[model samples]
Target: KIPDFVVPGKCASVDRNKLWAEQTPNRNSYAGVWYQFALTNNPYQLIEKCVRNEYSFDGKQFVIESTGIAYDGNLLKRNGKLYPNPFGEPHLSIDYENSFAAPLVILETDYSNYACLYSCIDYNFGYHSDFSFIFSRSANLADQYVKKCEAAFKNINVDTTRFVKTVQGSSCPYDTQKTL
Candidate 1:
């Protein structure tokens, strides 16, 4: 199975270009820091990091504490796929406001090194907004592994031209966040 980390959101259609739909994460594979290589959306900063906690009793749930944005959320795995339920209580507030859960899909990952993610939601009018992410275990990843990251996205027809790269350097602060 191709293991992956967590992100809170929802899914609406099948055109989302999700890969490895039949696989689930390895209980012990997804933990620690995952540096962002590229993201489909632009954040406030170029340096982003996600520190994930270990899985729960059945390995179907976990938490993610991140940098850049103080996002702390819960992840639920169902049918070998992950669906994020961010900010439990606020989740109800957010849903009451917009009414959508973006399904965070793990396109591919080796569990220990790199992971590619895809998430999307339909607007009902005929258009949809989707997001993708490239993560690595190390802040400084190899060029070859970087290529592999892009290849996986390309395989699903995801555009990489506009992908924003996350910068990792001494100027960046350490991960001081906590996940429950």
Candidate 2:
């Protein structure tokens, strides 16, 4: 039987954070490419070398296009708002890119370097899978910042052991793209 697991609780809302607000006032601040630093054991994130999010805004909702080498792509358009969950933290709750998908919770983010995300999906048979991710602005996040990501999870009693470092280097396809 698959046992239940613990997901990290949300960090307090950025709205009340003057520092965070100074950098990120809205969802559009997240617009850009972010590399995967680490992820829990989820099937979708188990890509070839690494995964990256290409975030864009459509004036209504944020569109996140996840792309990687040896991986096609996955698009998610979500409307985000600050609401306190049952846990009492005013986390960013991303609603309905689809009915089948659960809310993509933004656990924490620095707006410049790192972001921690969490979500859970139910299979409807007394089974569910929880996923967590650490995203960095650069493909290779510094070790100190990587530990900072791990520390965020650890603070909320989430198991850091389940996290697997995503492989990222110049060989990945993100390097081959020409933005011009």
Candidate 3:
């Protein structure tokens, strides 16, 4: 049974407990795995930990949290608020406008262990386009890692040349909420 998020019907209030109960039997059947290929060789080992819990089934569409990782490296905490990086980082951020998709941020690595990479897929348009990204603990990624990511993007039909590396301002202050 599809959860309310996947049910394609509008409802004022959904009985989440009921939905879970109804869907529990088929949860392990592996019929509706939307992210099959993307998780195969996730280099950073982030697929299982970071991406899974960030998604919510809202009874109609899969609701994804835009900010994947804001913390240093541990997926438990979120750091300061900032727009997605433009480039130089390995993560890709995209926004939709007038039937066209535009890249918001490219690849840039954050060297700190507390840093994170984030991306989201917008399934509103039947999966023709999807967003993916890599976050680093530091802005300085190994040259080999960058090359690998670029190769992966090319293999996945993403236009790597169109990606632009972004740089954070040196004077900008990160979010100061300590205690992860």
Candidate 4:
């Protein structure tokens, strides 16, 4: 099953491309650091593999079946619960004080041949909507850590061609905006 940490957000019917374009001017241009985890278990099994499964109100709690893969510490859970993240919607809300504990910044790509397709939606949306991340953990992630994550993605046969750029920032919005 996918780690409870990989939360799914609500699905949007709005034209993601149009929404992204409209939000472009308001997009956060600041650089932010991010990481990706490969789910060793079938996270979808919890939802019966349904792409548009219903979600809880607070955006926590979902279903997934095990996929018989090794569990890596890459997946981070909050209070032992996975936060909900829907496509085309704001998966995370910025809380200046305690943002470090959430996956505030992340990119979700497909793990299979259909991975690129997932990014296509983000490309159309004009915003980084392909994947979601919220960090209530550490704000600054070392470069070495990120490179290690990249290597892990490669090992899983994930296509990295569409990897256009990376953002580096603090998990805490206050930290991101504050001048150190």
> Considering lDDT, where higher is better, how would the candidates rank from best to worst?
2, 1, 3, 4
Root-mean-square deviation of Cα positions for candidate 2 versus the true structure, in angstroms:
6.2
Could you give the candidate ranking by TM-score, starting with the highest?
2, 1, 3, 4
- Candidate 4 per-residue lDDT, tens place, 1-180, comes to 643323244322334454344433433321122222222222222211101111123323322111111234122222122232344353332221222223222232222111111221222323323332221123343455445445534543443442432222332223312221
Clashes of each: 6, 0, 37, 38
**Best prediction by lDDT:** 2
Per-residue alpha-carbon lDDT of candidate 3 for residues 1-180, written as tens digits (9 for 90 to 100) = 522122132212223344334433432221221111122222232223322222234343233332223335433332122223355342223322223324332222222221112232334533333344544334344566556666655554454554434322232122321112
Give the candidate number with the greatest TM-score. 2
Q: Which ten residues in a row have the lowest lDDT in candidate 1?
A: 89-98
What TM-score, over all chains together, does every model reach? 0.61, 0.65, 0.31, 0.23
Residues 19-103 of candidate 2 have per-residue lDDT tens digits of: 3344345667777777788888765442445566677766645655555654444222222233324453433344433323344
Superposed Cα deviation of residue 97, candidate 4 (Å): 22
Q: Which of 2 and 3 is the better model by lDDT?
A: 2
Per-model lDDT? 0.50, 0.60, 0.32, 0.28
Q: What value does the lDDT take at residue 95 in candidate 1?
A: 18
After superposing candidate 1 on the true structure, give the runs of residues whose Cα lies further than 4 Å from its correct spot. 1-22, 42-58, 69-100, 175-180
**Which candidate do you rate higher for lDDT, 2 or 4?**
2
Model 4: worst 10 consecutive residues (lDDT sum):
47-56
In angstroms, give how far residue 94 of model 2 lies from its true place: 6.3
